[PDB]
């Protein structure tokens, strides 16, 4: 949770090879701005990304300073990482900033249930890929993006815990049922899109859709 000011830098830190800095801003879904390799110290920026304006460093060490604020700059900030065996990427802790002067959809509302009752959230996906995976994951109020569920392109459907995917490849619809909704289970979820399983893979979010479980 960090304030600044336009003209003003930020150094987002990173709790967790490859690195991959994502931007979270209200109402949109999140994106990656780019990733970087601590090994050959390379960085690779995404399409309009400006070079210069992001600088990355480190291998307690990984930062990543923003050089130039802006009101838009504001948002909050994850670092994230490939899992050792590819299941899943993982997120870093989360990082507020506030700077003062292929398609994934899921367009499913704010849901509102009863605790231990079952919710299923919608998701949609465009794709030319012939081959993809979606993952799942759980924004809590802390801001951690949590990793949940991963559907592929060519499982059958997944189950794991209370959660469930009920996998639609002709219609490319891969809705998330939540079983025994509890308190807890109150969150944002975002569903995932991604290509192959590799270091520079990247992931298309949608704009997550608001559980609130109720008494």
């Known amino acids: 949770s960090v304030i600044r000011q336009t003209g003003s830098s930020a150094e987002i830190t990173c709790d967790l090879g490859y690195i991959h800095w994502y931007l979270h801003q209200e109402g949109k879904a999140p994106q990656r701005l780019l990733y970087y390799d601590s090994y050959t110290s390379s960085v690779v920026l995404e399409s309009g990304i400006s070079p210069g304006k992001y600088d990355t460093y480190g291998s307690k060490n990984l930062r990543m300073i923003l050089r130039n604020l802006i009101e838009n700059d504001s948002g909050v900030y994850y670092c994230a990482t490939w899992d050792q065996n590819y299941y899943k990427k993982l997120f870093g802790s989360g990082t507020s900033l506030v700077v003062t002067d292929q398609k994934v959809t899921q367009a499913q509302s704010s849901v509102s249930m009863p605790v231990r009752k079952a919710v299923t959230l919608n998701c949609l996906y465009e794709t030319s890929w012939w081959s993809y995976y979606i993952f799942w994951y759980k924004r809590l109020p802390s801001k951690e993006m949590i990793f949940l569920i991963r559907?592929?392109?060519?499982?059958q459907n997944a189950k794991s815990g209370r959660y469930s995917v009920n996998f639609k490849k002709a219609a490319k619809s891969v809705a998330l049922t939540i079983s025994a909704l509890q308190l807890e289970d109150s969150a944002k979820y975002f569903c995932?899109?991604?290509?192959?399983?590799?270091?520079?893979?990247?992931?298309?979010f949608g704009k997550g859709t608001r559980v609130t479980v109720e008494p």
């Open positions: 559907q592929g392109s060519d499982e």
């Open positions: 995932a899109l991604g290509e192959s399983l590799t270091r520079a893979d990247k992931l298309i």
